Write a protein that binds this ligand. Sequence first.
Ligand SMILES: [Hg+2]
Ligand code: NA
Ligand code: NA
Length: 293
Amino acid sequence: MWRIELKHAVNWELKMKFFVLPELPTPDVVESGVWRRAIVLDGRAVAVMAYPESERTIVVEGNFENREWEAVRRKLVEYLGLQNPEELYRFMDGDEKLRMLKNRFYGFGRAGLMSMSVFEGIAKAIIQQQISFVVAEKLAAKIVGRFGDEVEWNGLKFYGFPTQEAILKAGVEGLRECGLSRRKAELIVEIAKEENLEELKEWGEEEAYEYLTSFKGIGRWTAELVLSIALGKNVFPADDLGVRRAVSRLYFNGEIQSAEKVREIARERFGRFARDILFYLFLYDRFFSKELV
Ligand SMILES: [Hg+2]
Ligand code: NA
Ligand code: NA
């Protein structure tokens, strides 16, 4: 048992609702409000699970060492988005439509990340190209099942996203076998060859953008999605069709707007909080719009 003590309440149920296929190891599994996965920690996979004991206290259990707690805690705070949302909430209150979003998903707090490594974030962004998020997540589950780490601890199985090494071994054909198009498989293997990839998190936005887009098959949308959802940078992915739909529904009474207009809105209304608001827009798009002939 370790405990993460928060200054502000978090709605755990809303944090978990963010997961699209909670039962399936994508690699994350959420079962009866308990989240778990295997994470690679100093070259070895460990079991980690987390669940609330109160509005302001998240319990963590796992088979890592006590001296590794500080590192694990930092990773979970950033990934699950547990940081004090007071200032975000104050800011959202100042805009009629943001206030509407804040209240619809109240207690969601700040945005986390959608991966526990840069490699995982890039691979998943590539998988998602030209397909729905639900289809992308099933593909992730196939790859995790065959090529990911597996840890058995207590009576429970913990799944991890494939290491760069595991992907290189899977190769193009192993990824194609799991359902990936040839080019996607090719690009993921390409990325797997890169050294020091976790350092990309600490690069500047513009440098990271030029690195990502320097790969053939990674364009503006994939690079901006990685920057925001994997790297934690305040880069707003306006080409995303779900984002365009949500912003149009909120501010333009459902009249579909261009990416350039959405960018303009984010600049004017979202400011330093655009990355947090982006996660609220994903929820809005999924849960209040995603007929009749
Ligand atoms: Hg403990
Ligand atoms: Na899952
Ligand atoms: Na490119």
